[PDB]
Amino acid sequence: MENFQKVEKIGEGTYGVVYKARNKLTGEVVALKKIRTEGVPSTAIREISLLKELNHPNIVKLLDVIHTENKLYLVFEFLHQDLKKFMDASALTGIPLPLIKSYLFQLLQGLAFCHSHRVLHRDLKPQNLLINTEGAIKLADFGLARAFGVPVRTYTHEVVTLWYRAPEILLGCKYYSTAVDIWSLGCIFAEMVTRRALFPGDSEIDQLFRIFRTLGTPDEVVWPGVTSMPDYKPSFPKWARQDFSKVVPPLDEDGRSLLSQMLHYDPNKRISAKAALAHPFFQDVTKPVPHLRL
Ligand SMILES: Nc1nc(NC2CCCCC2)sc1C(=O)c1cccnc1
């Protein structure tokens, strides 16, 4: 804008573009996101003003919300790296387990807070998880799937990642619960551990089937109500479940146990962020500093 000097493009979302920018005045360096319209639905404009009050050490702070000229600009505190780039940078050696554990622990604290305040993230992915030199990791880019309804995509079109999407969303459940964020985090935890996306689907059905091939095609026994889901088809192939020992080696039993609870098919059986924080896997959690090359 006129009060911000754009340093560079931080990212191109399907719904908005993100810039690293300096407040010509406060001298502060921030992440500026301009959102796409007739005047942007006020229904969200009030929903956004809510996230502004949602402050926690593991949630990227929303500093300012500026509504003007058909554009909505979200001003966020700036962090230097995201988890996707960090994992790519650590692919050769892998992120040390104590750091993986610290990150998972902090993200769960962030979610327990969001969830206790009736706020769902809805689109957790490594790219939306920001880290700094002090060992913190923060939830970013929350709601963008509840504002502009269900539009086409984006200008020149960009492929949305389905890899972290919960099965109930893929099966057409219209009402997401806090459980979809736990699922996404479980997928991310597995990914930090194996250094490979857990369910790299390239279509909604391929995403769903990759989940079924690994966790077994769900049925009424493991997921009461699943065969009544909107997009469920009796014709889905029936795959047996694989052993977690094979899915996230060499993760220890404490980790595999927590992961299995984060990946339960039934949203109602899936562990809550709060309960996950009490899992034995975090008995020896610490806060290591990552090796960040900026
Ligand atoms: N606060 C913040 N800092 C960023 N720094 C970036 C991180 C990657 C490397 C360059 C600096 S991105 C970002 C976001 O709020 C954000 C993130 C994803 C999607 N939409 C918004």
mmCIF file of all heavy atoms in Angstrom, residues 10 18 31 60 76-82 85 127-128 130 141, ligand 1:
data_model
loop_
_atom_site.group_PDB
_atom_site.id
_atom_site.type_symbol
_atom_site.label_atom_id
_atom_site.label_comp_id
_atom_site.label_asym_id
_atom_site.label_seq_id
_atom_site.Cartn_x
_atom_site.Cartn_y
_atom_site.Cartn_z
ATOM 1 N N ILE A 10 6.127 -12.879 -0.714
ATOM 2 C CA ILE A 10 6.286 -13.967 0.256
ATOM 3 C C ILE A 10 5.534 -15.228 -0.166
ATOM 4 O O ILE A 10 5.853 -16.339 0.272
ATOM 5 C CB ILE A 10 5.717 -13.535 1.634
ATOM 6 C CG1 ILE A 10 6.752 -12.753 2.427
ATOM 7 C CG2 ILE A 10 5.229 -14.748 2.408
ATOM 8 C CD1 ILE A 10 6.207 -12.286 3.769
ATOM 9 N N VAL A 18 0.838 -12.612 -0.656
ATOM 10 C CA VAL A 18 1.540 -12.203 0.555
ATOM 11 C C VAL A 18 2.878 -11.555 0.254
ATOM 12 O O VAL A 18 3.679 -12.103 -0.494
ATOM 13 C CB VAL A 18 1.779 -13.409 1.471
ATOM 14 C CG1 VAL A 18 2.380 -12.950 2.792
ATOM 15 C CG2 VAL A 18 0.475 -14.144 1.701
ATOM 16 N N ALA A 31 4.307 -9.176 7.390
ATOM 17 C CA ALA A 31 3.858 -9.966 6.247
ATOM 18 C C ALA A 31 2.520 -9.306 5.909
ATOM 19 O O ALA A 31 1.605 -9.283 6.724
ATOM 20 C CB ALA A 31 3.642 -11.433 6.628
ATOM 21 N N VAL A 60 0.444 -17.007 14.643
ATOM 22 C CA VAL A 60 1.034 -15.817 14.033
ATOM 23 C C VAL A 60 0.099 -14.621 14.356
ATOM 24 O O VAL A 60 -1.100 -14.662 14.102
ATOM 25 C CB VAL A 60 1.199 -15.985 12.491
ATOM 26 C CG1 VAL A 60 1.773 -14.687 11.857
ATOM 27 C CG2 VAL A 60 2.172 -17.140 12.219
ATOM 28 N N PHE A 76 0.312 -9.197 9.188
ATOM 29 C CA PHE A 76 0.765 -10.199 10.157
ATOM 30 C C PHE A 76 2.212 -9.983 10.600
ATOM 31 O O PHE A 76 3.013 -9.411 9.870
ATOM 32 C CB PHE A 76 0.695 -11.602 9.541
ATOM 33 C CG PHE A 76 -0.704 -12.101 9.266
ATOM 34 C CD1 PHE A 76 -1.239 -12.026 7.982
ATOM 35 C CD2 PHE A 76 -1.468 -12.678 10.280
ATOM 36 C CE1 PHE A 76 -2.516 -12.520 7.701
ATOM 37 C CE2 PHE A 76 -2.744 -13.179 10.019
ATOM 38 C CZ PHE A 76 -3.275 -13.105 8.734
ATOM 39 N N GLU A 77 2.540 -10.457 11.795
ATOM 40 C CA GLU A 77 3.923 -10.387 12.266
ATOM 41 C C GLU A 77 4.683 -11.266 11.266
ATOM 42 O O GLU A 77 4.171 -12.291 10.796
ATOM 43 C CB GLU A 77 4.078 -10.974 13.683
ATOM 44 C CG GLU A 77 3.737 -12.442 13.788
ATOM 45 C CD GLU A 77 4.094 -13.095 15.149
ATOM 46 O OE1 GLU A 77 5.275 -13.076 15.570
ATOM 47 O OE2 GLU A 77 3.189 -13.666 15.786
ATOM 48 N N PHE A 78 5.903 -10.878 10.951
ATOM 49 C CA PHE A 78 6.708 -11.608 9.971
ATOM 50 C C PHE A 78 7.623 -12.668 10.601
ATOM 51 O O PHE A 78 8.248 -12.408 11.626
ATOM 52 C CB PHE A 78 7.548 -10.591 9.182
ATOM 53 C CG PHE A 78 8.461 -11.206 8.161
ATOM 54 C CD1 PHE A 78 7.992 -11.478 6.880
ATOM 55 C CD2 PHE A 78 9.782 -11.545 8.483
ATOM 56 C CE1 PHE A 78 8.806 -12.080 5.930
ATOM 57 C CE2 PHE A 78 10.600 -12.148 7.533
ATOM 58 C CZ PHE A 78 10.109 -12.417 6.253
ATOM 59 N N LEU A 79 7.677 -13.861 10.010
ATOM 60 C CA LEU A 79 8.597 -14.902 10.487
ATOM 61 C C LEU A 79 9.422 -15.243 9.264
ATOM 62 O O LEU A 79 8.918 -15.155 8.155
ATOM 63 C CB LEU A 79 7.883 -16.131 11.043
ATOM 64 C CG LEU A 79 7.546 -15.978 12.528
ATOM 65 C CD1 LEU A 79 6.157 -15.301 12.657
ATOM 66 C CD2 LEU A 79 7.538 -17.344 13.209
ATOM 67 N N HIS A 80 10.676 -15.642 9.466
ATOM 68 C CA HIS A 80 11.576 -15.877 8.334
ATOM 69 C C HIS A 80 11.530 -17.164 7.550
ATOM 70 O O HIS A 80 12.151 -17.242 6.475
ATOM 71 C CB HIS A 80 13.032 -15.668 8.774
ATOM 72 C CG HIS A 80 13.380 -14.236 9.024
ATOM 73 N ND1 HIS A 80 13.009 -13.576 10.174
ATOM 74 C CD2 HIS A 80 13.998 -13.316 8.240
ATOM 75 C CE1 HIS A 80 13.380 -12.308 10.090
ATOM 76 N NE2 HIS A 80 13.980 -12.123 8.928
ATOM 77 N N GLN A 81 10.840 -18.181 8.066
ATOM 78 C CA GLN A 81 10.819 -19.453 7.336
ATOM 79 C C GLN A 81 9.551 -20.231 7.621
ATOM 80 O O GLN A 81 8.900 -19.999 8.637
ATOM 81 C CB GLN A 81 12.058 -20.290 7.690
ATOM 82 C CG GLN A 81 12.264 -21.505 6.772
ATOM 83 C CD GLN A 81 13.718 -21.941 6.683
ATOM 84 O OE1 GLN A 81 14.018 -23.132 6.635
ATOM 85 N NE2 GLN A 81 14.625 -20.975 6.644
ATOM 86 N N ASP A 82 9.191 -21.147 6.726
ATOM 87 C CA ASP A 82 8.025 -21.968 6.973
ATOM 88 C C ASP A 82 8.520 -23.402 7.092
ATOM 89 O O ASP A 82 9.670 -23.696 6.759
ATOM 90 C CB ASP A 82 6.932 -21.792 5.899
ATOM 91 C CG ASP A 82 7.365 -22.247 4.500
ATOM 92 O OD1 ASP A 82 7.894 -23.367 4.351
ATOM 93 O OD2 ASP A 82 7.141 -21.474 3.555
ATOM 94 N N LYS A 85 9.763 -25.341 3.728
ATOM 95 C CA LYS A 85 11.138 -25.049 3.329
ATOM 96 C C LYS A 85 12.111 -25.669 4.324
ATOM 97 O O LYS A 85 13.156 -26.197 3.941
ATOM 98 C CB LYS A 85 11.374 -23.526 3.228
ATOM 99 C CG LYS A 85 10.525 -22.866 2.162
ATOM 100 C CD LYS A 85 10.620 -21.347 2.189
ATOM 101 C CE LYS A 85 9.719 -20.710 1.123
ATOM 102 N NZ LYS A 85 8.273 -21.077 1.270
ATOM 103 N N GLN A 127 3.581 -25.330 4.673
ATOM 104 C CA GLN A 127 3.757 -23.955 4.208
ATOM 105 C C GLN A 127 3.106 -22.926 5.111
ATOM 106 O O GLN A 127 3.513 -21.772 5.113
ATOM 107 C CB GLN A 127 3.138 -23.776 2.830
ATOM 108 C CG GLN A 127 3.701 -24.636 1.766
ATOM 109 C CD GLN A 127 2.777 -24.681 0.567
ATOM 110 O OE1 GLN A 127 1.972 -25.611 0.418
ATOM 111 N NE2 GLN A 127 2.862 -23.646 -0.283
ATOM 112 N N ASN A 128 2.059 -23.333 5.824
ATOM 113 C CA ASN A 128 1.332 -22.424 6.728
ATOM 114 C C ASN A 128 1.825 -22.458 8.177
ATOM 115 O O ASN A 128 1.187 -21.874 9.056
ATOM 116 C CB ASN A 128 -0.166 -22.755 6.732
ATOM 117 C CG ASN A 128 -0.828 -22.432 5.417
ATOM 118 O OD1 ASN A 128 -0.295 -21.653 4.608
ATOM 119 N ND2 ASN A 128 -2.003 -23.008 5.195
ATOM 120 N N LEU A 130 4.944 -21.445 10.400
ATOM 121 C CA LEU A 130 6.125 -20.591 10.393
ATOM 122 C C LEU A 130 7.048 -20.771 11.582
ATOM 123 O O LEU A 130 6.592 -20.929 12.711
ATOM 124 C CB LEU A 130 5.665 -19.151 10.322
ATOM 125 C CG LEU A 130 4.600 -18.982 9.245
ATOM 126 C CD1 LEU A 130 4.198 -17.538 9.250
ATOM 127 C CD2 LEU A 130 5.102 -19.439 7.838
ATOM 128 N N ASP A 141 -2.070 -18.291 8.299
ATOM 129 C CA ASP A 141 -3.019 -18.433 7.202
ATOM 130 C C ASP A 141 -4.251 -19.250 7.557
ATOM 131 O O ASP A 141 -4.534 -20.240 6.898
ATOM 132 C CB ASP A 141 -2.324 -19.098 6.016
ATOM 133 C CG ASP A 141 -3.097 -18.937 4.722
ATOM 134 O OD1 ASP A 141 -3.956 -18.040 4.642
ATOM 135 O OD2 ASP A 141 -2.831 -19.691 3.776
HETATM 136 N N1 LIG B 1 3.498 -13.977 8.798
HETATM 137 C C1 LIG B 1 4.059 -14.576 7.690
HETATM 138 N N2 LIG B 1 5.430 -14.535 7.482
HETATM 139 C C2 LIG B 1 5.793 -15.166 6.380
HETATM 140 N N3 LIG B 1 7.081 -15.297 5.961
HETATM 141 C C3 LIG B 1 7.636 -15.981 4.823
HETATM 142 C C4 LIG B 1 7.729 -17.513 5.162
HETATM 143 C C5 LIG B 1 8.332 -18.315 3.984
HETATM 144 C C6 LIG B 1 9.710 -17.733 3.543
HETATM 145 C C7 LIG B 1 9.625 -16.209 3.242
HETATM 146 C C8 LIG B 1 9.045 -15.434 4.459
HETATM 147 S S1 LIG B 1 4.469 -15.862 5.486
HETATM 148 C C9 LIG B 1 3.373 -15.246 6.725
HETATM 149 C C10 LIG B 1 1.905 -15.478 6.656
HETATM 150 O O1 LIG B 1 1.164 -14.891 7.475
HETATM 151 C C11 LIG B 1 1.326 -16.416 5.636
HETATM 152 C C12 LIG B 1 1.894 -17.710 5.338
HETATM 153 C C13 LIG B 1 1.290 -18.552 4.354
HETATM 154 C C14 LIG B 1 0.116 -18.071 3.691
HETATM 155 N N4 LIG B 1 -0.442 -16.846 3.964
HETATM 156 C C15 LIG B 1 0.145 -16.036 4.912
#
